[PDB]
Amino acid sequence: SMTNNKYYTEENKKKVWKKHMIVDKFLEQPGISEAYLNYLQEEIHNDEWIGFENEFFEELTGKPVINV
Amino acid sequence: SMTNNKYYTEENKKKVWKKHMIVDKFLEQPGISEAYLNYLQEEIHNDEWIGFENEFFEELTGKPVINV
Ligand SMILES: [Ca+2]
């Protein structure tokens, strides 16, 4: 969670990996998953997300979070 | 699956990085942020989260997701 390639350190990569594992469980909780869907349905049209087309597509259509 | 270092590839690191930015804005929405901190309060005790205590602490006390 930062747009700076300078902060894109493998230590921060691991930090972010683990925090995403934590929040992923929260997103699957009933109610929350629907409000998250509503958020994405709104956010996918927000042109501030330059270059995130593919990640918005994967989250909205329920594609896996990572590539196995 | 995110626990297996076999998939800790660089493509997956970047994918997680960008998806975590998307999810971070949702967690700042009013209502959701409270529900998330409640979730964290409950879940910190579960043994699934052994060795995630630093991340739970950072998320619980409003630390930046990455160091910076
Ligand atoms: Ca809806």
Author numbering:
A (entry chain A), B (entry chain C): 0 to 67
Authors' account:
Our in silico complexes indicate that the AimX M14 residue plays an essential role in phi3T_93 and MazF recognition and substituting for a charged residue in that position should prevent AimX function. Next, we produced phi3T_93L23D by replacing a hydrophobic residue that interacts with the AimX M14 for a negatively charged one. The new charged residue had no impact on the protein integrity and quaternary organization as confirmed by solving its crystal structure and SEC analyses. BLI analysis showed no binding of phi3T_93L23D to AimX and a strong reduction (two orders of magnitude) in its affinity for MazE. Overexpression in the recipient cell of phi3T_93, but not of the phi3T_93L23D, restored the ability of the evolved phage to produce lysogens. This confirmed that phi3T_93–AimX interactions are important for the lysis–lysogeny decision. In addition, strains expressing phi3T_93, unlike those expressing phi3T_93L23D, blocked the lytic cycle and promoted lysogeny of the wt phi3T (measured by plaque and colony counts 3 h after infection). These results validate both the structural complexes and the common mechanism of recognition observed for AimX–phi3T_93 and MazE–MazF, which are driven mainly by the insertion of a hydrophobic helix into the grooves of the dimers of phi3T_93 and MazF.
